[PDB]
């Protein structure tokens, strides 16, 4: 309710020559009413007149009705920003000391320097990427001060601290002046000509984080940070995180959770002494000595006070840091650079060998029928897959620019050039195109761009693979639905005095030329061995293919451009953007540690008793025979590090005996932390999605962000949003959309009223917009409709389906086909065509609905059923779990304090369903959670068929059908179905134990009747209500359930017919 | 305090209307206003709420969910930076350890619902609503409806319900000497609760089990979601988030499950109905008195179905007790084949966000 | 006036392009629909047994009455006659409307236990409801009355018809495939409306067969609980 | 052209503004969102075992066939196989959608014994239907075909999928709150197209675990025959 | 009142329950209508073609399964003028779910699709 009112000042904060607000209601009469003073007050102020007089003439429109949106009739040119800031440019302009970065262009330059003529000139090393404009995050921090200008108490010190800082901002770009951004939201040559070219992305990093400042520690960290960026942007937040790895081995452990053997978080009292030997403390120096003659002042100075004492209970201020660090932008340098960064080896490549076999090695011999028909799973994977050229193609009488890798099947079959058992050589001849990924303080890395005979001829092994590691600990990331809680109790786990932990950081290692041929030579082999267990063409041919796959890269040069020209040359090293990749690396990488481990047993003795991958880190936990001394971890250290040396690899082997740090997670103190450091105002790529998306995107990281740590301003947010959802219908008039249109459960909402709190419609209004925004969610597009009219798109669907189907499959037929209809929006024809059309509509939805024939029912109108049937009544929960994340917000942690975590994932996909496993034995087609919802809501008659036409033998379908099983599998396709519509495994929610038995105390439910449909949402409604209770208010409440035997009949019909809302920015999901 | 009801129906009709020239405004009317959705603002009959009837409440009540949710070309973006990515990814992977997505999904859109907050969204969101609301009252006519809700629900049962005059005398005394004269005889004859009624399943076992292990705490739409679902994959849901599979394994087959599958429900059900807000707070929906003239056959055995008749029977008489100082009493005789089509519809529900309506006081 | 103004805009715009809409929410008319299919009907044949009393009804309407009778009573479409509402009411004066009540029984017992406590019914009694088996029935009640209020099943003309009369009743022929009291319900009172309907727009009767399978049945009993409304007031027939 | 055309201006007015819909209808995507809280997902692992016989399928794809194979049957989407259905056809030549068999049977017995009449079935046979056991059981199928059909759980991709696998059904863990066929049934597949989703999207397998309160059930249950549809044909993958 | 109380106890309403929905569910599949009234869909021969286990005595369910396989078989062969048998193993637990959405089911009014002629 206060981001209504809260819009209001910012609007009038901006426009200062009317603001005509826009009721809707589902009462009939009110209604009118509603249109009534909407009418009169256009005629109001296009007359001049005031406005008074009609809201209190229309009281019953303001008090009982529902706000739509704002309109907003303006006449200046939004240049407001110019004459705003002057204000705040009392400050010194900030020069940056151009000798500081190692590669010149990083280095904060003078655009019309770095780029001396216009067609030289290229944003592609600073563009935000962001759909916002920098004057905007401008004109929004503005606005903030103008409000807390005169906060009093600490509120003002927020203010002096924000002030202060601020005013750095606004005194550097007063002098250039404010750039001005073009409807692509980039920044073209001439704005940028005269300016430094590091500016615009500096301003929304220094923006961003003097935003997010609060206590005084903040206020050092934001100043600091803001000032070096401006010069500094290529170590600054490597050097201000490095550091954080030491840390973490010296603080001892006072007691924390670990892993039971129902593996499940259990508290232990444990003690263990952080000892650490003395060279290790010179090489935290060395980190602390790089930061100072880096310029860093304060927060070196903070590690140092923290040095004295290393008290867990001041250690949230080093998470600070090292989650701050991050915040200060992404390192963008020249594709070539990044590209130009890339005996003993039996050991190693013979494990990486072995593992390949063992996660093939059943399948093989029995000749999966995965493994025979891996070219139609592949094919159809195709949605899933990476990314490829984005080549020419011509569908029925047109021609089109499209780049996913499906499509290009469907050229290619349909003009016989479709040629998979001939997977192109990515050498000399054909090279590989490239791709980037670039991530907050770390060296940039490239992305092969391979054709898709290289994904089908992929999929199969991998997939196979997976199931391996799927039931396998060693892969920390793959096992079972294991969430990253299980990862950090296995280590603490068997921490003592006498076992040492040891992690590393093999990302170099992965691209290190050297592993290359290991790497390729074992995966390769391992397919050899496999090959000589069948006698199955099918199999073999797809053995033999994926083994091409090693052999094509050992050898491959790679397009890399350099300017406006596409140079070429050769590259020895090993990259990403194969099936196999994130697979096979671990594969790698674990063999590696297995290596290295082994090699230094030679020396110690010792015990292994967990062993972990994890992407770009590996560790492990080894038990000695005595008590770990000082000296003994030196030696250990040491002798791995030499290890790793004569393998000729770069890598950051550490050892502790308390605590980790990796990429994903650090263990400090016995406690789990995660790194908070995801920008908010500057994107790494410029996706697809649109201006609103990219809003309910940002209030998606803003979250995470808070729950790890990091905390931008929620006013700030606000504000943005109300910047990125808004749409001009003139040249003079915005529709700012309501906080109903906003935060309402549909394919529109961008975010919640209150934090980590989900709502749905309880009140008519509600579900009256409710039903009528679905309506206009899903509008053709004229482009992804005839693309399925030519020849392509139907002789593509039914040769896959030819080898498929066997009986009247159009079940499965008619999803295939919006299997692409769903993604080839993507197309920027038809991203773009749907998007700019859908504003048309939009637009004129807000103004009159009323007609819609609704009929079609969710969540919102079954939730809304039971509601009535539960008795609320005040009750009483103790804490009694202690704290192991202790950067969760108050009110979140506080849930986790009184009913505990889980450290599972709740199935929500009907994966561990016994129909699903059935249709998965035989046939390799895999029909979703909406399919299986479907098809189980079928007739025994109808569901055989199904059956059937995909290849489950009729003895075997036969006996699903009637047999006990299938009935119980009905009750969990339903259940998944309605955890998947609850994000039950997303946001925060995945971080609540919903199975607690202190939530299912508060819980009161008789059975009328064992109907596991009914009692099951009764009781997770029942769940839901009593949580979010409990983070909108820290106490609980307790409810009682009389659902009558007649209402659930009703109910039970409902629940097989609840429709979704697309909405994919919601995405909130973290660990 | 009681300011004149019709001059807060002219302030309505005020803050309601919008303009779409500079000398004509549009007023909606009561229809638009009142029917239950995200823009209803009030009621045509205080402490009285009603629910699509007609074919044409339906009609628009469905029309209007559609333009509900629209986009925000600035929410997604959002989404679209390292650094949303970075924060999600970051809070997921120290709380996920299988395929969490459906925790995900929920964490992202988290975000997205309170991102408009920020005044560009907000005024964005809010702003071109009211393109879309002007031309939406214009024509609609195409809608491919398929959704479900309370209205859709409740419409369906009534058919079945027969209604006859009763009688309820007046037993207890009064203690709350301001409640209107409707509203107090509503106490003085079936009485009133000192307690609320669980509207978010906290009070689940499946919650607790979340709750002891994991510090994720699922809202009741979620836990509605994923009860939903099959053992298989609800069994997976509580690994992901860090349940024991020993104990993990028996809640998904153990009888508590099923139970708890009802449970969810009713939170979920009394959510969508305000039974907690509003003047319904002060209600005994237990009533010995309000129970008698309720009248339901027990077709078989089924908790859910039961349930709603039964609620819906009670709202009913309750409402009707406020329109009229009456009393009726409701027959139900809903065959054995609605009950299944019914109890299909039951977890299909979707909501109506209007946060406005807020009337929970006490 | 706002509202009223502003829906024309909206509306307006709503004729000319829709086919953008994100529908999730079910209704009646996503429930009947799906009903439809599994009833078989045939001819039957009904006699004018009852004589008339009230000569003015037209004489499709006049027609039903003398077929199967007329009622003296209303249909229970508040949920008033339950015992989670008496109990709601006896202790606490809060009154949840039917669609209340109709969430709130739709919750799990653990839920539903502190809806009453925090209204201020007694714990000890507030949890002898929640196990009871009373709740159970209670939960098929506050449905039934739920989807009679959106049948308008006590309005219009239907106010005038013995829904429940023997007559009609054997028109209609439905199995029971399991004791499941919701999708019973419905089937039947489907059945029902659906023989008035035609004898009213063809003075002739037909009987209605049902062969829902037990897989359909669970599927819609899902649908029950998700029901929506449309709150148009005008259709207010109610006369008598 | 008339259509097409007069789309366009609603479609573009749509986007404009909403915030006024008298929902009530409800769909899968609300039926899903309601069990997805219910769905605890934990980390599982499922080992290669089949062989490749379909070589060009994406890795991704060709992974869950590697895993928990395939199927070379179709999965009754119409409802073909049932009794009711069988009976329409054995008499009468006329032929309702798996809609209407869906509608028909989420009626009342009564109801349903007319239509098969009206169509030509023999009342001595009409009647046994009615009242039989296979009734009951036919109406679980004709839900499971309309969900199915709703799921294209035999178009797309998924037609390669052997969705009754014994590798993911293990993945699956559904308790019997209740002998309840339908919600059973959508909790399942639900279950197994999440962990199917998931693999897809991730190579590494979920376990989801259910706990779905018995009082749930029933609210879902009615929301079950209560869905409506979404039209879109070009979704059309269905190839073999 | 005698006569009202005992219905709503009484068996027959539980089941008149389960028939007010076969109604409800047929009306919106036009089952009676266009050329599905010429099919007789309670055929032998159409049944053995359809698959389903009892999962539970849950008319609701059961029942729109059963028409949904057998709508879903006939549309077949229309369309391709073969048939396909269906199998069904709807979990338990997504019964509950399903069962809530039937009886939350909204119409949709177009009477122009009137093709009723026998």
Known sequence: GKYNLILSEYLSFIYNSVQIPIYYSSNSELENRCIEFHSKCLENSKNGLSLRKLFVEYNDVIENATLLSILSYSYDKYNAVERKLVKYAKGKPLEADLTVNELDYENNKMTSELFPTAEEYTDSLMDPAILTSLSSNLNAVMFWLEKHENDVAEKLKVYKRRLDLFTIVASTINKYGVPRHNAKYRYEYDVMKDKPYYLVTWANSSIEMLMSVFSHDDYLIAKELIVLSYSNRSTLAKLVSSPMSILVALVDINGTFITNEELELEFSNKYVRAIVPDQTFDELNQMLDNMRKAGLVDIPKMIQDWLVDRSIEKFPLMAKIYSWSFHVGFRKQKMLDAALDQEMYREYTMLIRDEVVKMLEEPVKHDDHLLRDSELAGLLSMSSASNGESRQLKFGRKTIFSTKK???????????????????????????????????????????????????????????????????????????????????????????????????????????????????????????????????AKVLQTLNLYKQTQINLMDSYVQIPDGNVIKKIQYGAVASGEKQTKAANSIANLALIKTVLSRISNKHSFATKIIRVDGDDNYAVLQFNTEVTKQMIQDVSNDVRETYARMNAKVKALVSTVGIEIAKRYIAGGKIFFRAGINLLNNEKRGQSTQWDQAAILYSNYIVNRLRGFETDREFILTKIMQMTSVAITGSLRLFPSERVLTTNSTFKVFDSEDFIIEYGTTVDEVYIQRAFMSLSSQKSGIADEIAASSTFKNYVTRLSEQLLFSKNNIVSRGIALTEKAKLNSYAPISLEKRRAQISALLTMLQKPVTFKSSKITINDILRDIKPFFTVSDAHLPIQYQKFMPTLPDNVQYIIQCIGSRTYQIEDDGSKSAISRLISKYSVYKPSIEELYKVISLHENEIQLYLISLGIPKIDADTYVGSKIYSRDKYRILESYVYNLLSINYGCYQLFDFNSPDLEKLIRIPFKGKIPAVTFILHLYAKLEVINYAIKNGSWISLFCNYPKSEMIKLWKKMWNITSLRSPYTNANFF
Not at 437 to 455: A, K, N, Q, S
């Open 406 to 536: 499906n499509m290009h099947v469907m050229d290619d079959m349909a003009n016989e050039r479709y040629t998979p058992g001939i997977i192109p050589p990515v050498n000399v001849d054909k090279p590989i195109p490239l791709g980037r990924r670039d991530v907050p303080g770390r060296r940039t890395r490239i992305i092969f761009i391979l054709p898709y005979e290289y994904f089908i001829a992929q999929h199969a092994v991998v997939e196979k693979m997976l199931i391996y590691a799927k039931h396998t600990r060693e892969y920390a990331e793959f096992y079972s639905q294991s969430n990253q809680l299980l990862s950090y109790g296995d280590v603490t786990r068997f921490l003592s005095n006498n076992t040492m932990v040891l992690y590393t950081d093999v990302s170099q290692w992965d691209s290190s030329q050297h592993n290359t041929q290991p790497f390729r030579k074992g995966i390769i082999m391992g397919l050899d061995i496999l090959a000589n267990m069948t006698n199955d």
